[PDB]
Design an enzyme around this catalytic site. Structure first.
Site, PDB file in Angstrom:
ATOM      1  CG  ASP A  20       9.697   6.838  -2.423  1.00 33.70           C
ATOM      2  OD1 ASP A  20       8.752   6.063  -2.692  1.00 33.70           O
ATOM      3  OD2 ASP A  20      10.473   6.717  -1.444  1.00 33.70           O
TER       4      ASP A  20
ATOM      5  CB  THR B 224      13.172  10.791  -1.632  1.00 33.72           C
ATOM      6  OG1 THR B 224      11.924  10.091  -1.712  1.00 33.72           O
ATOM      7  CG2 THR B 224      14.362   9.701  -1.577  1.00 33.72           C
ATOM      8  CB  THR B 225       8.716  13.039  -0.200  1.00 34.74           C
ATOM      9  OG1 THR B 225       7.547  13.875  -0.059  1.00 34.74           O
ATOM     10  CG2 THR B 225       8.700  11.960   0.936  1.00 34.74           C
TER      11      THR B 225
ATOM     12  CG  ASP C 111      11.554   3.080  -0.309  1.00 36.41           C
ATOM     13  OD1 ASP C 111      12.224   3.487  -1.295  1.00 36.41           O
ATOM     14  OD2 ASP C 111      10.395   3.502  -0.108  1.00 36.41           O
TER      15      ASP C 111
END
Lengths: 512, 517, 508, 509
Positions: B49, B82-83, B380
């Site tokens: 993440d 998120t990444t 998540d």
């Protein structure tokens, strides 16, 4: 003890100015090119106008310090146009810099800065249109079209008209300042972005949930508000402590005796009249027990500034002791309603008896939508507030500056010798502010400037550059309407700032 | 002094973003390659993440500092991708640099990015459905469960962890609005079992205090007596010895403890409830006596720990032993004691069907490493279903949506031209970085695989046909079973664009040498 | 790779050889004294190999095995401490050759133990038995060894005394092993070498007691390792002072305590007590001591930790570190306890006759001046060490360095017959041997390579022939002038040496 | 602070791993070349080992990828026992072969994904190389012997190794039908000879009390208890500390004295002859037991006291919560005998005759400690070989057979997975080449011959590193179990794939 003197010394002082003039170069709209300025205290900093950060800088020249000081003077009066002053002063001196080499070292310069500044102010004031609030308009509908001017620039779609008419209502009612301080705009997460709410009074963004937060009352019809800059919790008054042991009842006694002191604190103010307790310092878990059980409302962890707005509007007053204090340290409202909007619990105090805060409450439910709305509504509130105070309104966009530059080109012909040269630098300097508007709209800045001069030689109109549309055209007929007075202040402050630096060229410093 | 001015300052920024971007790029999808953070004590951790890795990471530049905040908002709503915001934000700049070299200002492009975001979302909305109900969103949630587990702690679907995870969120939704937060739901982990030992808790779980493994363990009622007052004399979180000065007062002190056990046991009984939560404690001997007398205590409860139970029950905690009535206690729908660990002592489950404002899904783990990964999957999961409840849409995402939008935004550069043309071109290739770098990390060429999916974008639109994201020979996204929320992918598009708007604002590239301290 | 251990190992070998070079010229009676500078800036003159290595070594891993190697030699033979270093470094010369050739280190380490096993065979055949129950045979073998040692001046007088101690500790024909765990070296101020004597029991150091009895027959050997007073406060005593009153309150406890302890010892029955220092026992009372002596019990107070562990094995007076453990079993049986103030001034406790497992002898060594006492202490040590070596291993071999050529020559020929990849290792090992008698000949003074070529040829034809002779400096029979070494003293030099060379080769 | 990008991260990772693989490749197997342990950061003293496990703990590493290797090595020591060094070498080898693939153009996932499919194929091959042995008692003896002798040499101790192998296999042999170690006590104890060692058929506490207390009991009755005397386990019969007086110091000492004695009485009331206490026994209750007729053992172990309770048929008191109300244990005889120069207490006639104690007799402390560990790794192996009584042909014979299995697979395949299969086979095969150097016999000849056998199909020739030639394996003293090997293959791979997958190494130091 240091001493430095000379014609290259003068050249130094101007060069320093350019460096600060670059920091603030463009910030008129939302384009340019920033670098996050993070301090050595471990704080990250940005602002919405580039003059703010500039104030914090400490300049090691005294000549450069003068230009810092005039920033502080503008910011306090109008609260806008602060950037503008830096640009004109610096730029004036830039075209003067190679003129000093040639022979413009003499003090005669100061005289020329006065002739140019005195004419120019007068031309604004005469050309500007004086319009009542009851001419053929409502007071709110004049200021609707002026409030739109900030709102169109960024970056909020068609909701911009609606928000505009709303944002006005707060400003008229309070009016007696030129600052946005007693208004403000509060973001709220969640809720409709297709309508927003104008609340008369104060509100709180969030109060944290505690043990029996829903077992406390959320509605009152005569809420009497206790403003506390103190706290009670386990670390503000203890509830753990050593006792002697030789019976079980010793243990009971100590916890019992401590719970009493914390119960005294809410009671004494409740009996004065309180039932609403507002505090910006934390309230704990032990703390909230007494309140939940009494069925008396509590709030902890609300912003320090917001609590201070609550004082003015409800007529309450700060305390530092919550024991044995009058009921004249309390304020009232007529309506307390708690409605949870989005993820955050929202306290609304309205029905305020003297109503010395009214504030727009902007609901969007994002971070993206809301910071750009807030950015535009900050400058909206500045345009409308100042439209009550000076009732002369002129075209912005740098359209009027292009006209001054015309006007001064004419003047340079009958004005003699060393002074003429000084005037030609004034005229060239006025075009810098619109050049940056051209850089922001996305054009070739030099190509554009020249087309606006053409319609200031073919009609003398209002042709300038728009960032409020991102095009070139008349700005009066595009409702880019801001007072005469911002421009009056910015000229006179820019000349004043200027004359000091070019005059000094002999600096005596002591590192003692 | 030193000064990076205009163009120079902008070049510097580009160098920061593409290094951050690339670390994230080789971590895209379940074909991702893990992150190892080594700290300043040299303690090794394995995470995934964008949001988490940045937060740990000591910021070295200005764009790096900007991304941490950005990531954390993506993590809260969406909890995935998120990444992928970060990869898109840096990427878009890496192209802006190429536009810069041609002779376009960063100003012109940056306005047309906002427009190019607006057209991308528009295209998105057409892709996949926008109508589900909560007994039919479950099949995409099973598709989300495959990928989310199988790149973190395990490389496989685990149907037990997934199904526990989705219920918890639904319990809170029906109490208010069809909306949940990220503070109304939590994953609390405590080590003792294995990762497949899990529970669905409908309220909260507290450690249950027992003096010995020979004392009685009972539970009864369905209701919790939440107290701060005693249920047996205190000993309020400090040292105590015995300070008697005669034999006589020692003998005296024991009979006085016997009566107080009885009297509190009855006072709670009478109001209703008979399991007590008391914030204070008492020594080991007195506790053992009360457990023998029966009707189990819970002793040595944290100051936060009591606040947690109260918020979830919705009721209040009494400040006193005098004041007790059933009203003044919190409301539970069941209290039952469950075996925590698999060789450890029992815990107290307080489920609630009365009110819920904190629903914990109890996860057990072996090691500190294997629990932290396992909870990463849970977090998540909580978040993707939060999007569904509020408005029910999903998109096929992993590569499918991005490329379809990309082709769309490309085409309009040439319909429009003018200002936004360059901005559109750069925006359309940025979107395509996302399937591309996913193939870079993965076993198969990035150029080749991108080319494959692009062919099927001209042949057919609104595709269930993206790139591989199970490391397969075939390429779909219906048979690779990656689904995102439509809002989730939508939120990425906004965020990436955002980063560009923030760096543009002022013109203060002036630094005294303070700009990252 | 194994490249980087290869590079490390050569560096280690070179450092070990350099330190070992100094000792090749310190070898034998004709050895060259070494003036050694400490990190303390003091010059130390030694000709004993072992202490040179110990007192300062370089910081490389093969250098450390050398201190260890000779330390191991001391316990095992006590002899050939100098020679054992010589063969170790000489072997490491041989190894570089093998390595380059492509004989892997694993091969050279197993071959080096295999070559020891093969070496010992050849040695034994040469060796010749002597009696181990007869006094005269052990003395001749010990006397020859003494001329070779550094110390020799008073060793004539100390040699018959060294055998006498050892003979009593030999009781069956196997002659046991004879360690120094039964022969005790005690020194006494004053007296001569002729005054030295073998006391049947043990002689203990110091003697504190002048209120006690001074001769008690039929004594019971009691051992104290428990206190005589209630524990420390701040002194070894429980009593301390900071107020007049404060001393009184501690005294109430102490007074009670000192009477029950002193009385408890007497009730069980003891007339010798062995008491340690006031820094090795947490309390002892002067008050408790005055009474304990005045009950007519013979006391030595003040003795070492090392002494207490020594006594416990030898005279079977087992630990008593608590009140509970004084029972009859722990006590010894002494025939006499006696003060001697003759044959050297100062008072020591002799217990003459003791009921003992094994058999324990003590030699009070003695001398007129402080340095005379130290020379004789060295002299018994040298003398006793060789006797113990011969009783372990009955056969007798020659000294002079001749055995060392004789093994080598056989080991070369045999290796070639056997053949194998390891042939090179056993052949080079035998040539490693050729260095030590050669290095010895140089110190005796005669061109060294020429000496060791010629002795090889004498061994090849005749076998038992020439060796390095101290008179000649060179090549003359050692059959006409007996130079003997015990069989264990040569077995030790070789087997320990190989093990050290084995570890270094194996070491990364 | 520093963000190491995927390639740059690979090199640090590789070099980390490899630096470690050299040390443990040399230590490997019975003829393996030693390590020198160097105590870092504090002094610079030395010890010599041949144990791969010890290299890591004593001498640490600051390379992030190399830290993964350390975590992996811990897991072998306990669960499997042997294979702590055997794993660490293969994992470094897998990465070495990885190097050429990352360079070429080939991404890390390609290499991972194809080694997972390869691990499944290698496992199938481990089953094939695994032939059942030690189903019958005769064969079962022969079966434990081979594995156990392997372990000791590889973790150091090879001199007195054979004597310990006889006692260790006999110990496991008694159990029958269960892999206990929960009755097989391991006692390492000063005294005795390095040559002698002893297995008592019963249970043995090495703790003694002198000849000043009873030690001869016939028809013994056992109480197992945890009873304080100064620790002060509950069932107090003393006093609280309070201070009211300047003579109060005296009062405390007395109050402890009535405590010690009242507890002796409660013990006494069980009706027993043998009392065992984990805790201290003060000078005062010790004498009161010797008078009562009851044996006193103080300073019993937490492992042994509990473990004793099961075998004899007692039950523990658990912090003295049972003062008369816990069931006894029973033995036929309690004799004190001298084994070595020590006094031992010999429980014989133990109820569950499964129980045995293996008593290790040192005469050099350096040997005695290293011996305890190496023998514990061996007993972990032994007890898993109860659950499945089968061996694989060790020596390099299995490693080649897994390599070859994976080589035939490799050939079939032309995809992305196929690439890594070539790498994986090579990795497995690269382990006997290390074993070949350890022999001291050139690698190329042996390994190539070995390769040839296994293609054709043969597991009845392996590498004899104890003859330096290619030789028979027919369950000799140089085979390995199936038990050790399955776990060693699984972990080497698993570790390597985690090192591959981590390439976003952010070091904040």
């Amino acid at each position: 003890t240091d001493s430095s003197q000379g014609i290259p010394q003068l050249v130094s002082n101007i060069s320093a100015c350019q460096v600060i003039a670059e920091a603030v170069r463009t910030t008129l709209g939302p384009r340019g090119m920033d670098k996050l300025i993070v301090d050595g205290r471990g704080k990250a900093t940005i602002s919405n106008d580039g003059a703010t950060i500039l104030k914090l800088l400490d300049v090691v020249h005294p000549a450069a310090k003068t230009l810092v000081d005039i920033a502080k003077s503008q910011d306090a009066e109008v609260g806008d146009g602060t950037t503008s002053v830096t640009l004109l002063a610096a730029e004036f001196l830039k075209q003067v810099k190679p003129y000093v080499e040639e022979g413009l070292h003499p003090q005669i310069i100061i005289r020329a800065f006065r002739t140019a500044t005195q004419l120019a102010v007068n031309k604004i004031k005469e050309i500007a249109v004086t319009v009542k609030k009851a001419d053929k308009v409502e007071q709110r509908k004049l200021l609707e079209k002026c409030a739109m001017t900030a709102l169109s620039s960024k970056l909020i779609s068609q909701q911009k008209a609606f928000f505009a008419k709303m944002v006005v209502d707060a400003v008229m009612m309070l009016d007696d300042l030129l600052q946005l301080k007693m208004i403000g705009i509060k973001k709220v997460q969640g809720g409709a972005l297709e309508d927003s709410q104008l609340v008369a009074g104060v509100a709180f963004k969030k109060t944290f949930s505690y043990a029996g937060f829903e077992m406390q009352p959320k509605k009152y019809h005569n809420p009497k508000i206790a403003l506390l800059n103190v706290e009670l919790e386990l670390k503000a008054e203890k509830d753990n402590a050593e006792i002697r042991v030789h019976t079980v009842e010793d243990y009971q006694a100590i916890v019992d005796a401590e719970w009493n002191i914390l119960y005294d604190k809410l009671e004494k103010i409740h009996h004065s009249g309180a039932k609403v307790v507002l505090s910006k310092l934390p309230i704990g878990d032990v703390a909230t027990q007494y309140f939940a059980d009494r069925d008396m409302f509590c709030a902890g962890r609300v912003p320090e500034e917001d609590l201070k707005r609550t004082m003015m509007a409800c007529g309450g007053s700060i305390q530092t002791s919550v024991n044995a204090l009058s009921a004249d340290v309390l304020g009232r409202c007529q309506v307390f309603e708690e409605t949870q909007i989005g993820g955050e619990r929202y306290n609304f105090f309205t029905g305020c008896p003297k109503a010395k805060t009214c504030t727009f409450i902007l609901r969007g439910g994002a971070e993206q939508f809301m910071e750009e709305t807030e950015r535009s509504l900050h400058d909206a509130i500045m345009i409308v507030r100042r439209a009550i105070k000076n009732d002369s309104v002129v075209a912005g966009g740098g359209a009027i500056e292009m006209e001054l530059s015309k006007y001064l080109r004419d003047y340079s012909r009958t004005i003699p010798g060393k002074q003429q040269l000084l005037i030609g630098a004034y005229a060239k300097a006025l075009e810098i502010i619109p050049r940056q508007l051209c850089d922001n709209a996305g054009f070739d800045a030099t190509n554009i400037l020249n087309k606006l001069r053409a319609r200031h030689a073919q009609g003398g109109t209002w042709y300038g550059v728009d960032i409020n549309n991102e095009d070139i055209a008349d700005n009066f007929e595009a409702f880019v309407w801001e007072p005469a007075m911002v421009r009056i202040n910015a000229l006179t402050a820019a000349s004043e700032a200027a004359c000091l630096i070019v005059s000094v060229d002999e600096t005596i410093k002591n590192p003692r | 002094k030193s000064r990076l001015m205009g163009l120079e300052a902008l070049k510097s920024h580009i160098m920061a973003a593409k290094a951050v971007a690339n670390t994230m790029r080789t971590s895209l999808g379940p074909n991702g390659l893990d992150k190892m953070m080594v700290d300043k004590d040299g303690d090794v951790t394995v995470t995934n993440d964008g949001a988490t890795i940045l937060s740990m990471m000591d910021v070295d530049h200005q764009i790096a500092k900007l991304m941490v905040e950005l990531s954390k908002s993506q993590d809260d709503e969406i909890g995935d991708g998120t990444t992928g915001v970060v990869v898109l934000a840096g990427a878009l700049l890496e192209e802006a640099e190429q536009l810069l070299d041609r002779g376009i200002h960063p100003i012109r492009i940056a306005d047309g990015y906002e427009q190019a975001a607006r057209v991308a979302i528009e295209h998105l909305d057409k892709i996949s459905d926008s109508v589900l109900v909560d007994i039919k969103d479950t099949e995409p949630l099973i598709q989300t469960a495959k990928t989310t587990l199988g790149s973190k702690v395990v490389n496989s679907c685990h149907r037990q962890m997934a199904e526990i995870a989705v219920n918890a969120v639904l319990t809170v939704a029906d109490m208010e609005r069809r909306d949940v937060d990220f503070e109304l739901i939590k994953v609390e982990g405590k080590v003792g079992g294995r990762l497949e030992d899990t529970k669905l808790i409908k309220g909260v779980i507290v450690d249950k205090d027992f003096s010995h493994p020979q004392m009685p363990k009972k539970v009864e009622d369905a209701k919790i007596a939440i107290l701060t007052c005693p249920f047996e004399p205190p000993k309020p979180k400090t040292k105590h010895k015995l300070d008697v000065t005669s034999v006589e007062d020692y003998k005296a002190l024991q009979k006085y403890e016997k009566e107080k056990f009885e009297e509190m046991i009855q006072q709670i009984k009478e109001t209703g409830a008979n399991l007590a939560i008391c914030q204070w404690g008492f020594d080991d001997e007195a506790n053992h006596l009360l457990l023998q007398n029966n009707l189990p205590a819970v002793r040595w409860v944290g100051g936060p720990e009591i606040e947690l139970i109260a918020i979830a029950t919705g009721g209040r905690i009494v400040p006193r032993f005098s004041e007790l009535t059933a009203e003044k206690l919190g409301f539970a729908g069941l209290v039952q004691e469950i075996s925590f660990g698999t060789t450890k002592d029992k815990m107290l489950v307080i489920e609630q069907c009365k009110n819920s404002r904190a629903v914990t899904i109890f996860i057990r783990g072996g090691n500190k490493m294997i629990i932290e990964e396992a909870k990463r999957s849970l977090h998540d999961a909580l978040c993707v279903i939060r999007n569904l409840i509020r408005d029910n849409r999903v998109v096929y995402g992993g590569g499918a949506a991005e490329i379809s939008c990309a082709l769309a935004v490309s085409q309009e550069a040439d319909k429009c031209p003018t200002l936004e043309q360059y901005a559109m071109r750069a925006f359309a290739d940025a979107l395509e970085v996302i399937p591309m770098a996913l193939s870079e990390n993965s076993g198969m060429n990035p150029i080749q695989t991108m080319t494959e999916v692009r062919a099927r974008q001209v042949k057919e639109m609104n595709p269930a046909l993206g790139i591989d994201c199970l490391h397969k020979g075939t390429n779909d996204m219906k048979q690779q079973h990656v689904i995102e929320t439509l809002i989730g992918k939508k939120q990425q598009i906004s965020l990436a664009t955002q980063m560009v708007r923030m760096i543009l604002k002022i013109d203060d590239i002036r630094k005294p040498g303070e700009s990252e301290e | 790779d194994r490249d980087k251990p290869a590079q490390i190992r050569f560096s280690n070998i070179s450092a070990a050889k350099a330190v070992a070079d100094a000792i090749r010229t310190s070898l034998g009676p004709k050895g060259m004294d070494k003036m050694i500078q400490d990190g303390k800036g003091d010059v130390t003159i030694t000709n004993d190999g072992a202490t040179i290595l110990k007192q300062m070594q370089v910081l490389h891993p093969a250098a450390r095995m050398l201190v260890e190697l000779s330390k191991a030699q001391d316990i095992e033979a006590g002899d050939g401490t100098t020679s054992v270093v010589i063969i170790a470094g000489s072997l490491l010369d041989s190894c570089t050759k093998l390595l380059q050739k492509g004989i892997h280190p694993t091969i050279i380490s197993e071959s080096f133990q295999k070559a020891l096993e093969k070496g010992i065979e050849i040695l034994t055949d040469m060796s010749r038995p002597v009696e181990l129950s007869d006094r005269e045979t052990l003395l001749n073998s010990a006397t020859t060894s003494l001329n070779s040692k550094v110390v020799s001046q008073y060793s004539s007088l100390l040699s018959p005394m060294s055998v006498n101690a050892v003979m009593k500790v030999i009781d069956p024909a196997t002659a046991t092993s004879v360690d120094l765990r039964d022969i005790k070296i005690v020194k006494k101020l004053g007296g001569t070498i002729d005054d030295c004597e073998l006391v049947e029991g043990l002689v203990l150091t110091q003697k504190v007691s002048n209120s006690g009895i001074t001769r008690v027959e039929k004594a019971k050997i009691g051992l104290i390792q428990f206190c005589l007073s209630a524990p420390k406060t701040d002194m070894d005593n429980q009593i301390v002072v900071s107020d007049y009153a404060q001393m009184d309150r501690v005294l109430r406890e102490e007074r009670a305590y000192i009477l029950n302890l002193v009385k408890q010892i007497k009730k069980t029955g003891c007339n010798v007590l062995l008491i340690q220092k006031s820094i090795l026992r947490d309390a002892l009372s002067d008050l408790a001591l005055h009474f304990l002596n005045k009950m007519k019990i013979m006391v030595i107070k003040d003795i070492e930790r090392e002494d207490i562990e020594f006594i416990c094995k030898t005279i079977g007076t087992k630990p008593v570190a608590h009140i509970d453990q004084f029972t009859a079993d722990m006590l010894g049986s002494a025939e006499l306890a006696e003060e001697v103030n003759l044959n050297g001034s100062g008072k020591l406790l002799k217990i003459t006759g003791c009921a003992s497992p094994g058999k324990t002898v003590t030699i009070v060594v003695r001398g007129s001046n402080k340095l005379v006492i130290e020379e004789a202490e060295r002299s018994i040590h040298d003398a006793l060490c060789v006797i113990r070596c011969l009783v372990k291993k009955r056969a007798l071999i020659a000294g002079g360095g001749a055995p060392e050529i004789e093994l080598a020559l056989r080991l070369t020929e045999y290796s070639r017959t056997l053949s194998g990849m390891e042939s090179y290792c056993v052949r080079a090992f035998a040539d490693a041997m050729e260095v030590i008698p050669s290095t010895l000949a140089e110190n005796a003074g005669l061109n060294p390579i020429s000496t060791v070529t010629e002795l090889r040829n004498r061994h090849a034809q005749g076998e038992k022939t020439a060796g390095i002779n101290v008179r000649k400096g060179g090549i003359s029979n050692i059959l006409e002038e007996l130079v003997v070494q015990p069989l264990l003293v040569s077995v030790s030099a070789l087997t320990l040496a190989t093990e050290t060379v084995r570890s270094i080769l194996k070491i990364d | 602070a520093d963000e190491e990008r995927a390639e740059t991260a690979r090199l640090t990772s590789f070099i980390g791993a490899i630096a470690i693989g050299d040390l443990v490749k040399s230590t490997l197997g019975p003829k393996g070349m030693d390590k020198i342990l160097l105590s870092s950061g504090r002094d610079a003293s030395l010890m010599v080992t041949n144990d791969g496990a010890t290299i890591l703990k004593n001498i640490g590493v600051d390379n992030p990828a190399a830290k993964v290797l350390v975590d992996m090595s811990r897991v072998q020591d306990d669960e499997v026992g042997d294979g702590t060094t055997s794993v660490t070498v293969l994992a470094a080898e897998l990465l070495r072969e990885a190097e050429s693939l990352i360079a070429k153009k080939i991404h890390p996932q390609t290499i991972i994904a194809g080694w997972r499919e390869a691990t499944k194929a290698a496992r199938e091959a481990l089953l094939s190389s695994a032939v059942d042995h030690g189903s019958d008692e005769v064969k079962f003896r022969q079966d434990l012997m081979n594995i156990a002798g392997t372990t000791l040499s590889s973790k150091l101790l090879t001199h007195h190794k054979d004597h310990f192998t006889k006692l260790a296999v006999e110990a496991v042999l008694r159990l029958k039908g269960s892999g206990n170690l929960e009755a097989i006590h391991i006692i390492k104890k000063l005294g005795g000879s390095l040559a002698d060692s002893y297995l008592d058929e019963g249970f043995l506490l090495d703790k003694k009390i002198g000849v000043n207390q009873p030690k001869r009991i016939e028809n013994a009755k056992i109480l197992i208890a945890n009873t304080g005397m100064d620790t002060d386990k509950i069932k107090i019969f003393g006093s609280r500390v309070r201070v009211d007086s300047t003579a109060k110091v005296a009062e405390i000492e007395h109050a402890e004295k009535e405590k010690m004695k009242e507890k002796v009485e409660r013990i006494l009331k069980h009706g027993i002859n043998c009392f065992i206490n984990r805790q201290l026994i003060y000078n005062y209750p010790e004498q009161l037991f010797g008078a009562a007729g009851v044996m006193a053992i103080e300073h019993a172990d937490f492992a042994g006291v509990e473990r004793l309770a099961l075998v004899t048929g007692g039950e523990i008191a658990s912090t003295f919560d049972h003062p008369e109300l816990v069931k006894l244990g029973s033995c036929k005889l309690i004799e004190e005998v001298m084994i070595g120069e020590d006094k031992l207490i010999h429980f014989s006639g133990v109820a569950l005759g499964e129980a045995c104690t293996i008593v290790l007799r040192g005469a050099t402390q350096q040997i005695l400690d290293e011996a305890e560990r190496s023998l514990h790794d061996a007993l972990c192996v032994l007890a898993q070989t109860v659950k499945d009584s089968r061996t694989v042909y060790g020596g390099g014979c299995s490693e080649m057979l897994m390599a070859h299995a994976v080589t035939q697979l490799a050939n079939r395949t032309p995809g992305k997975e196929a690439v890594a299969m070539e790498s994986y086979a090579k990795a497995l095969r690269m382990l006997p080449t290390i074993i070949a150097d350890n022999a001291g016999y050139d690698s190329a000849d042996l390994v190539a011959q070995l390769r040839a056998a296994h293609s054709e199909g043969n597991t009845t020739a392996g590498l004899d590193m104890r003859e330096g030639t290619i030789g028979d394996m027919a369950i000799l003293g140089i085979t390995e179990s199936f038990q050790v090997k399955r776990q060693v293959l699984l972990s080497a791979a698993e570790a390597a794939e985690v090192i591959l997958r981590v390439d976003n190494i952010i070091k904040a130091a």
